[PDB]
UniProtKB/Swiss-Prot annotation:
This is Endothiapepsin. The lineage of its organism: Eukaryota, Fungi, Dikarya, Ascomycota, Pezizomycotina. One of its GO terms (biological process) is proteolysis. It is an enzyme of class 3 (hydrolase). Keywords: Aspartyl protease, Disulfide bond, Hydrolase, Protease, Signal, Zymogen. The gene is EAPA. One of its GO terms (molecular function) is aspartic-type endopeptidase activity. It comes from Cryphonectria parasitica. Belongs to the peptidase A1 family.
Length: 330
């Protein structure tokens, strides 16, 4: 089997991407944030504290003839951005782009943090990291991909995120028309539960490539590119007037600037992030100070190849017995 679904930016900045997901019988379609940095499929629901729902579409398990309470199971998750959610668990039928999993754990939120409430466009998350990170207790549950894997034509999914435009998540096949050149594959460590890999270096604009190993995670659920402070300083030094602002929470730059590109290495291959992908717009409405899309990972504890990086590539998440990651230009 295979599946193919379009993923759509939630706003004009590509702050996140939503993908429609069918849950239950009859189907209830929710728009979920596919997150290769976590491993829980959780949704706003009829159980979510009413004051914490503000415009989201909810899953109502009592209206699904295939929903079953997973007795005694609870979940609770905290994300790197400080947000969180928790609740109980159903199993139900879940379909993405024509690919169906029966008995998928659907984590129903009883509580969500303010950031989730305040974002009316995201109805929940669909985790695509390794199932070892799943938070369900006392019996850990499998991700949608893990459940689908054996049925897929090939044990892979691909992320093809757009810049200020829709893109595609495919399951079970590689669309050879979706990228240019070849796909370069690189080793993955699953030791921390992430799609963790090592970039071979970087360049800023038309500058020379610096060969240096940068361990980080391919994370579709993180907006920005978070890299070591040395790398980030080298980038922003090429933008007149750019500075790190403790008050704002990162590097800012004059909105009148033209940003240089940023290249990262995948083995001997190179992925170029155009400068415009690095612009996250005014820090507040009407400001002429703009927020940068490349930020320091110092104090995160890990480097994160988030959407800024991934949307410059066609990315293969290869879930073979020994997982790997592939990157192609597009």
């Amino acid at each position: 089997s295979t599946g193919s679904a379009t993923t759509t930016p939630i706003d004009s900045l590509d702050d996140a991407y939503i993908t429609p997901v069918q849950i239950g019988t009859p189907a209830q379609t929710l728009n979920l944030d596919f997150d290769t940095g976590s491993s829980d499929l959780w949704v706003f629901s009829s159980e979510t504290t009413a004051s914490e729902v503000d415009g989201q579409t909810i899953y109502t398990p009592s209206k699904s003839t295939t929903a079953k309470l997973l007795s005694g199971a609870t979940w609770s998750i905290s994300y790197g951005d400080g947000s969180s959610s928790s609740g109980d668990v159903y199993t139900d039928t879940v379909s993405v782009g024509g690919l169906t999993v029966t008995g998928q754990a659907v984590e129903s939120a009883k509580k969500v943090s303010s950031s989730f409430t305040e974002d009316s466009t995201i109805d929940g998350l669909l985790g695509l990291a390794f199932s070892t990170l799943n938070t369900v207790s006392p019996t850990q549950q499998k991700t949608f991909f893990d459940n689908a894997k054996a049925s897929l034509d090939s044990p892979v999914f691909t992320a093809d995120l757009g810049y200020h435009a829709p893109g595609t998540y495919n399951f079970g096949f590689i669309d050879t028309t979706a990228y240019t050149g070849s796909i370069t594959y690189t080793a993955v460590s699953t030791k921390q539960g992430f799609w963790e890999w090592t970039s071979t270096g970087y360049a800023v604009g038309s500058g020379t490539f610096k060969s240096t190993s940068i361990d980080g995670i391919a994370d579709t659920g993180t907006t920005l590119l978070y890299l070591p402070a040395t790398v980030v300083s080298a980038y922003w030094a090429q933008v007149s007037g750019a500075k790190s602002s403790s008050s704002v929470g990162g590097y800012v730059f004059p909105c009148s600037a033209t940003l240089p590109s940023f290249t990262f290495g995948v083995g001997s291959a190179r992925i170029v992030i155009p400068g415009d992908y690095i612009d996250f717009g005014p820090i507040s409405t009407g400001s002429s100070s703009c927020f940068g899309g490349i930020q320091s990972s110092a104090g995160i504890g890990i480097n994160i190849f988030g959407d800024v990086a991934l949307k410059a590539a066609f990315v293969v998440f290869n879930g073979a017995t020994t997982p790997t990651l592939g990157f192609a230009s597009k």
